[PDB]
Design a protein around this ligand. Sequence first.
Ligand SMILES: Nc1ncnc2c1ncn2[C@@H]1O[C@H](CSCC[C@H](N)C(=O)O)[C@@H](O)[C@H]1O
Ligand SMILES: NC(=O)c1ncn([C@@H]2O[C@H](COP(=O)(O)O)[C@@H](O)[C@H]2O)n1
Length: 262
Amino acid sequence: ETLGEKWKSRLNALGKSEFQIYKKSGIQEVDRTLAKEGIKRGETDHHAVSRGSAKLRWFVERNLVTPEGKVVDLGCGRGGWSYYCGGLKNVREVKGLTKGGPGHEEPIPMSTYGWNLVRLQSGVDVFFIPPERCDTLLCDIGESSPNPTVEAGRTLRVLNLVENWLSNNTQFCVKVLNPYMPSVIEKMEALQRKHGGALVRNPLSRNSTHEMYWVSNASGNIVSSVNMISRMLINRFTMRHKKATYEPDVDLGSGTRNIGIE
Ligand SMILES: Nc1ncnc2c1ncn2[C@@H]1O[C@H](CSCC[C@H](N)C(=O)O)[C@@H](O)[C@H]1O
Ligand SMILES: NC(=O)c1ncn([C@@H]2O[C@H](COP(=O)(O)O)[C@@H](O)[C@H]2O)n1
């Protein structure tokens, strides 16, 4: 029921080569080369396990999401979001959960700052476990599909999932894979009405996804928000100068935290 649908078809209609070029046109990138080589080498200090750490950092260093207390990371994969939160000031406990298993990102043990406050377990399907009480809820789940109706389903599953974990003034950051499909817009509107927050586009996301994140400390008419991104993604189809701007990767430190305010 929208304009992002025009974008998706155009996207799908791209040639393999055209596609790769577009996917990174004028986006923001994280310089991960050395971080990956160090990880591959067994290093467990400083490195982010994925570009997700840098991704979360962007929202956090802007107070769009303020992870505190018990943080639950739904679909932590390797744990970029979890290890990152494990080094943040007022965070006490970090629990990350994923499916893992062959053909899936499995959590990677690390000794980055606060790693001791972080527990990651795979072999978990978040959709069928009971909700635990938590102060901040993070969720980065959402598999992309060439078929926008398939994505719309996946998106809703996630929204319903999180609604079940959100309480009082729970802090949250949740990926909304396909925010432009009308059932997803409809649900988002309900949620926003019920828990506030807004949808925000992360400059680090690639042009090949219309993904937006529902963050707790931000507002803005949903529909308006998605169209903005839709127009933007379309504008980017036709670009002179398609370079990606890079930035150093995040450094996650290497110690253990003792907690206890003091
Ligand atoms: N039902 C489910 N239960 C648990 N994990 C799931 C799931 N469906 C998908 N996932 C997982 O969710 C992950 C999302 S990608 C993880 C990104 C992470 N924030 C990064 O920074 O490291 C995938 O690795 C996938 O295996
Ligand atoms: N035109 C192509 O050659 C091509 N390849 C992938 N895509 C679009 O982008 C989406 C996911 O992006 P990616 O495959 O992980 O980069 C797909 O689901 C599809 O809609 N398009």
